[PDB]
Amino acid sequence: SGFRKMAFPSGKVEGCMVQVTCGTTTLNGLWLDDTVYCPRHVICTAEDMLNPNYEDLLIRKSNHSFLVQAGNVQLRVIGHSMQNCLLRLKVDTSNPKTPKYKFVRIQPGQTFSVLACYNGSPSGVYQCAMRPNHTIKGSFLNGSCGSVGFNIDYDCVSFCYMHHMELPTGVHAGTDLEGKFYGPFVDRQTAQAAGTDTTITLNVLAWLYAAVINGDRWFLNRFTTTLNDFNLVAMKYNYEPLTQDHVDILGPLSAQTGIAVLDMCAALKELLQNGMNGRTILGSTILEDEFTPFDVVRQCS
Amino acid sequence: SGFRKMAFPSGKVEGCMVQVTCGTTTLNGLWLDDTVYCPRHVICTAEDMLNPNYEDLLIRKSNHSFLVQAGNVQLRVIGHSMQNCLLRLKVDTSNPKTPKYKFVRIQPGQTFSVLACYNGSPSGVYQCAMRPNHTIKGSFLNGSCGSVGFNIDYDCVSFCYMHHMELPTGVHAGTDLEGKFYGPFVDRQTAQAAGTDTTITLNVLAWLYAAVINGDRWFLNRFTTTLNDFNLVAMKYNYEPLTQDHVDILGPLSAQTGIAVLDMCAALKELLQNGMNGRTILGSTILEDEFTPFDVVRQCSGVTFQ
Amino acid sequence: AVLX
Amino acid sequence: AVLX
Hints:
The complex is a heterotetramer, with two copies of chain A and two copies of chain C (4 residues).
Chain A: H1 11-14, E1 17-22, E2 25-39, H2 54-59, E3 67-70, E4 73-75, E5 77-79, E6 82-83, E7 86-95, E8 100-103, E9 111-118, E10 121-129, E11 148-153, E12 156-166, E13 172-175, H3 201-213, H4 227-234, H5 244-249, H6 251-257, H7 261-274, H8 293-300
Parallel strand pairs in A: 8-12
Antiparallel strand pairs in A: 1-2, 1-3, 2-7, 3-4, 5-7, 6-7, 9-10, 9-11, 11-12, 12-13
Helix pairs in contact in A: 3-6, 3-7, 3-8, 4-7
Chain C: no helix or strand
């Protein structure tokens, strides 16, 4: 028992991490087979960064202007090309530590592990969620670009995120492994800011189910609610409207705990109206929305 | 920016995890060179666990009775012995993924990462702390025994924890990699319970330095305090007494920020006596106690591991 | 106590 | 926006 914000074992991802330098700019790259992926803005000097034309910057580069390194060891770049906001560099040798993998675009509200890296070297791993406004509340220092987000289904790594930038508020923006940005942000330094964010209702309920499964039950109550009456309240408190699809998803956890979903909603309703009155849930004094229903079920079984 | 509790990258440790089975009992083992380490309670079944003579049970056991699985491959055990609460199985193959490593007994309040495993296969990694009461508020299901806690310093893996059991309150107890328990616990199914726990003042203070380092400093004040006076407040709030030794461990962080520990104790004293009002620290509503002075450095400095 |  |  117990319940932790838990990340996927990162070893499979560690053996894919490389460094990519183009001039005075160094960041991380992801090495699978004979190809290296990194943010295309490795080619920009910060100068270019206020209004970069990436077609212009890229056409002016040679394969040999990219310094790719696996630790101390250079990989000869034999090919380059651009994919949305990614750079794909072909190299002359294969990464034998390459795992079974796939590229996936996740939906806001979902979670994944980030392997923060600097200069191609693993630094730390943490579990986090895609905010509803498509930002990540992360811990990225200068040079963390190219670090990836991933999930692991068995022996297969699903890469869903690559890190590109920090926003004015101090959250982080990036792309899937095809280079398409999450959200309405662009790789250039202007005054873009994070849109309004909400709380991930679906996750809060899951987390409450986790607390319950773990002998915490104080927040429960005798009432129930309809979906509509729940949304009419929850939306005053800045929570994502809850849908029937979301209810269904909570199905297995309802069965396990024997607490009916709408009942758990009633519980949440009061928590929002009355705070926690000093009390805590699974250690926390706030409602955590960074666990998906699926996470809860894997950690609690 | 942003500040998260981070686990160490777990690759180096993932390649050491195997599955150990004795009849009905399966758990995880740690495979370093040609030796596998696991909880000696693997040689037990349903009833046994209550109170068993390990010295005695082990004597019946033969090597062939240990099934050791690394990936799809059975390791052939060619020796076995007991070392405090651990079993040492000697195998015919030296683990080719053996990292540079060492065994360390860590002190209470200190942090490490946990690679949770089941059937020899890692499931997750989280960061936790050894509580003042010698337990860890971990997350373990059945089969997790033998899962290990660790730190990394460059290329060197520092093993410090092996999981053995869960206590009545849902917290966790285990050994160093010498098989000696943390706290007064024993590897049998009796009625042991965690003593009352306290908040890790040293870590709260480290965390406050971290806030300040990231430009979060509203909570500072122009005042100071005695060690003694601070302890009279802290202990009202269930805080570990702070000691001169803890003061010195914060030295580096105090030097980096140019704020005296006692000056920061003063600030912390006010946080406890008045709360945060409406504000947050590192975007948290509570005072975090699971970052050590060294975690703060490691992290606010981009430290990596080869 | 529970031996996990 | 600081491309990190």
